[PDB]
Amino acid sequence: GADRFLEELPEVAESFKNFREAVRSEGKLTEREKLLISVACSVAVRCDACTRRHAEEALEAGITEGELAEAAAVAALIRAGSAMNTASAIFR
Amino acid sequence: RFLEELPEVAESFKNFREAVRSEGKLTEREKLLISVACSVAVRCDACTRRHAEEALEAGITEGELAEAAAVAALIRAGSAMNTASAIFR
Amino acid sequence: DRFLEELPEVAESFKNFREAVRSEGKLTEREKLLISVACSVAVRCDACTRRHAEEALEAGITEGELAEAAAVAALIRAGSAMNTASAIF
Amino acid sequence: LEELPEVAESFKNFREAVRSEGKLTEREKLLISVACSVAVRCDACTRRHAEEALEAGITEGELAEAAAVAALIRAGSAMNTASAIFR
Amino acid sequence: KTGADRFLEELPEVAESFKNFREAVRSEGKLTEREKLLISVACSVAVRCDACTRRHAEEALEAGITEGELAEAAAVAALIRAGSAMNTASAIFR
Amino acid sequence: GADRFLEELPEVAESFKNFREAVRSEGKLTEREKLLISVACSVAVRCDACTRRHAEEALEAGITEGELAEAAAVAALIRAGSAMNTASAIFR
Numbered sequence: 236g237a238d239r240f241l242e243e244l245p246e247v248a249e250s251f252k253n254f255r256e257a258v259r260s261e262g263k264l265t266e267r268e269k270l271l272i273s274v275a276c277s278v279a280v281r282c283d284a285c286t287r288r289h290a291e292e293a294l295e296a297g298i299t300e301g302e303l304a305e306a307a308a309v310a311a312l313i314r315a316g317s318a319m320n321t322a323s324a325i326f327r
Numbered sequence: 328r329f330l331e332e333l334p335e336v337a338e339s340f341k342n343f344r345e346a347v348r349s350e351g352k353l354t355e356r357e358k359l360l361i362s363v364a365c366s367v368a369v370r371c372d373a374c375t376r377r378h379a380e381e382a383l384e385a386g387i388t389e390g391e392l393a394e395a396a397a398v399a400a401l402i403r404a405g406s407a408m409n410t411a412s413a414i415f416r
Numbered sequence: 417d418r419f420l421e422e423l424p425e426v427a428e429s430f431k432n433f434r435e436a437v438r439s440e441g442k443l444t445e446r447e448k449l450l451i452s453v454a455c456s457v458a459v460r461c462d463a464c465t466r467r468h469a470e471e472a473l474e475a476g477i478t479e480g481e482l483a484e485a486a487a488v489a490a491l492i493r494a495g496s497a498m499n500t501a502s503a504i505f
Numbered sequence: 506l507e508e509l510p511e512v513a514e515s516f517k518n519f520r521e522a523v524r525s526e527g528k529l530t531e532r533e534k535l536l537i538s539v540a541c542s543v544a545v546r547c548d549a550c551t552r553r554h555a556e557e558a559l560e561a562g563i564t565e566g567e568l569a570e571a572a573a574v575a576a577l578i579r580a581g582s583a584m585n586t587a588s589a590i591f592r
Numbered sequence: 593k594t595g596a597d598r599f600l601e602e603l604p605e606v607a608e609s610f611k612n613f614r615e616a617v618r619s620e621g622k623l624t625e626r627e628k629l630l631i632s633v634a635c636s637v638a639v640r641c642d643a644c645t646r647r648h649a650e651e652a653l654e655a656g657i658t659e660g661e662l663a664e665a666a667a668v669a670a671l672i673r674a675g676s677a678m679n680t681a682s683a684i685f686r
Numbered sequence: 687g688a689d690r691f692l693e694e695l696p697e698v699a700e701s702f703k704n705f706r707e708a709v710r711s712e713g714k715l716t717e718r719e720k721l722l723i724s725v726a727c728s729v730a731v732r733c734d735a736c737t738r739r740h741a742e743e744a745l746e747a748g749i750t751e752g753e754l755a756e757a758a759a760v761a762a763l764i765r766a767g768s769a770m771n772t773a774s775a776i777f778r
Contacts, residue, residue: 370545394509394512397509397516
């Protein structure tokens with residue numbers, strides 16, 4: 236139970252909701268940008284369940300799957316780009 | 328440097344990077360903001376630094392990057408929450 | 417075949433490595449079981465989490481205790497993302 | 506996280522809740538925090554959480570064993586994925 | 593890949609440039625096809641991507657590499673997985 | 687920068703060394719092949735010390751910089767490729 240885990244720890248569960256809510260409602264970014272970031276980060280972190288959920292919300296808000304593929308592509312690029320950064324350690 | 332060791336792949340990579348960077352479905356502001364979040368989400372300090380300054384020199388404010396960072400942190404915790412449901416039978 | 421198949425010696429040694437860490441007496445069994453589950457969550461391996469969770473449950477640990485251990489791992493993942501978040505500064 | 510008012514506040518509270526949860530002892534949470542820090546390879550977090558654990562009375566050997574569990578799980582999870590090789 | 597090629601359908605400009613990147617690194621002359629195949633499998637395992645593993649394992653099998661040599665490739669991924677953790681662990685000792 | 691760790695737990699340490707030797711001395715793959723895979727995985731997992739260490743041993747055995755840079759390249763590819771796989775959870 237994705238939330239059954241929450242029932243077990245009442246106090247940490249509600250405090251986690253406040254944190255989620257606050258970051259979800261923060262006004263410095265448009266809802267669209269925050270939704271795009273959520274999907275892109277879910278892909279970067281490689282969490283299939285999270286990606287589906289955030290993507291479905293992104294769709295329900297008007298974001299196309301094409302713009303979603305672009306956010307995913309950015310995550311793919313950073314994934315490769317960071318490996319390259321580590322790659323320079325092959326040199327003495 | 329590293330790229331230097333391999334001419335062909337380095338060129339292809341450069342092209343792949345410019346392609347996703349020059350994509351027209353998302354504005355410049357959203358792509359830069361996403362680059363910072365992903366960098367933070369995958370914990371690469373070198374990547375985060377470079378993309379953050381690329382975004383700062385494009386008008387994006389520190390506070391806006393902190394919010395982008397916040398989402399990444401939420402996803403790192405959220406993703407673990409999902410795995411945590413596996414403690415049940 | 418198996419997770420540990422085709423390679424007899426590497427499989428034998430991995431098991432002994434597992435046994436060594438599992439019977440290391442500087443920590444109690446309960447703590448090692450809780451650490452196992454917490455670590456499985458942090459690394460996001462579902463099958464690992466489920467298996468280590470069953471072993472802990474069989475040893476009397478509660479799913480509430482297991483939930484708190486996974487909660488610590490959730491916090492570590494969000495904290496670590498924030499550590500890299502302050503790499504630009 | 507001084508930059509975002511409610512987010513920082515709200516995160517701080519989430520942290521305190523996890524840190525104060527009564528189902529596990531302080532000792533057990535100190536070992537977990539360190540082992541988890543090792544498992545996700547965050548050196549800064551490992552340092553800080555190991556510092557706190559040592560100041561609480563936990564020895565380096567105890568901390569090392571916690572870390573050995575983390576390494577075991579990292580190796581173990583990859584082998585779970587290696588089963589895909591065998592179709 | 594109905595799911596990965598559906599991505600090709602959404603972003604032809606980037607997916608294509610990526611397929612070219614994949615091919616460049618896939619056809620480099622520095623390493624033999626055998627080495628690149630084993631490396632692809634072991635890395636898929638180290639990064640814990642199930643689909644990637646199955647996929648590269650097949651191309652490795654269809655290339656004549658045995659499951660035995662492949663299991664050893666993974667075994668090294670596992671070793672590096674554990675070794676990297678222990679490196680982070682030294683941060684414990686002050 | 688990982689030997690201090692082994693020190694505290696003598697048994698676990700020798701136990702890890704045995705495992706390390708069992709994989710290092712596996713006949714199914716050549717030494718050159720084993721050294722290339724160690725460097726690439728070190729990059730894939732993004733552990734610098736590991737990359738540095740394994741690369742150095744690889745250089746001493748005859749493998750060149752360019753061959754290692756290629757190894758790391760496959761790692762960059764797979765790191766990006768595994769993200770592309772997750773992105774498939776978007777098309778719903």
